[PDB]
């Protein structure tokens, strides 16, 4: 199988610079043209450049001229893109693609993409609440965690370490008033399947290096 | 450069209705056009290349069509899984340039929330926030009203809204309403209520709890 794996989310700040890695694996790395793509708040798409592995030759969007630079290692089948002088206009997800010739030329993988955040603010971790009713005899039931107050964007959520995903509802961060964000998770179940499962989130948060598990107690038991 | 115009970002289409996605270029690119779909994970596929090639493991639903300017993507049959953001890309001339997408909305049949309301946990009362979170689940359209009342007192100013993506199987939202309250705020008061109103509820739904 075919897979471009982007290296993690990174805040940086004002002026810096950050390399940006797609390790790729399951064809001949130095056979297809790598190229980069942004796509900012708008989900607005451009061509950045890209680069022929083989021999180090690049092509820029003149916009990206004085912005990136495009590099691979031959060695690792990886390819780089380090982005200089950054301000917030460059705050955006970037994704390297693999170019499939068929002249018909087209971007026939991608990778997953790579949250760029561009900021003065220092990073925060979340912290992670549970969510459960104050008590019970519905058709289904809900449980979930509260993932609050975190900086900057991304955090991942899953449910019994991937093992549950479905019902669940991870809801998009809100920037909060405070200018951190949060965001729920929640998962349903069917009320006579309830009680076949114990119910546990584990929260990431890469750029504050956070792993957290929050277990949502049942409260099955009465005296 | 050459400009690629999606006129239409946001369109409206019904489960087995026949969907038309059009792209315009500044000037003619010569059918060196290609088409993405973009799920709302951020995930990106491509379907179609050199204007009406299918990529291998597309489905048959879709097509492309156009020439010297005008280029459409064709969904002979919406399936729910075709919840998307599709985009053209010209490659023509450098720099590739792509149009600004078109978002699905898939119009199925009314289904009303299921609704659940959380108190705060004392793991968080004890840093001095109280977030109280109403879920409305896999409902359909996306309108609903979410209204809390604190003793009865209608709220107003101290809540904020998510609604996932329409789900890739069953076309329904999810949204959570979190009223944000002091701790010394949220202990001045007893009873805790989320009122819904949607269009598949003959009357609004309220979900409550006693601290």
Redesign the interface.
Known sequence: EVQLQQSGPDLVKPGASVKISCKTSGYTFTEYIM?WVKQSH??????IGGIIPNNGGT?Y???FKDKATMTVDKSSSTGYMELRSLTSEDSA?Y?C?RREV?N???????G??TLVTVSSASTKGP?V??????SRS?S?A???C?V?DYFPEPVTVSWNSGALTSGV??????L?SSGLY???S?V?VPSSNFGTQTYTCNVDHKPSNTKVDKTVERKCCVE | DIQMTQTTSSLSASLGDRVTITCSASQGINN?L?W?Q?KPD?????LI??TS?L?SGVPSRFSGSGSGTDYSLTISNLEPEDIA?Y?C?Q?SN?????G??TKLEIKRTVAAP?V??????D??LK?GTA?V?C?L??FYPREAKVQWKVDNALQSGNS?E???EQDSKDSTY?L?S?L?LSKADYEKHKVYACEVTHQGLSSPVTKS??R
């Not at chain 1, 708008?42 to 061509?47: A, C, H, P, Q, V």
């Not at chain 2, 951020?42 to 491509?46: R, Y």
């Not at chain 2, 659940?116 to 946990?121: D, G, K």
């Open positions: 190229h708008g989900k607005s798409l451009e061509w092509s969007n003149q916009k997800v994704y693609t068929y018909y030329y087209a971007l026939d993988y991608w997953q993409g912290s609440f549970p969510l459960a009713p104050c519905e289904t809900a449980l979930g509260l609050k509802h991870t809801f998009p961060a809100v909060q949060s965001l729920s929640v349903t | 060196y290609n993405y973009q951020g995930t990106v596929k491509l290349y050199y090639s990529h953001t985009y890309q490659y450098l720099p590739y340039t792509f600004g997408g299921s659940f309301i959380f108190p705060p946990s793991e968080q840093s977030s979170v879920l689940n896999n904020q998510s609604v996932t999810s959570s979190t944000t709890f006693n």
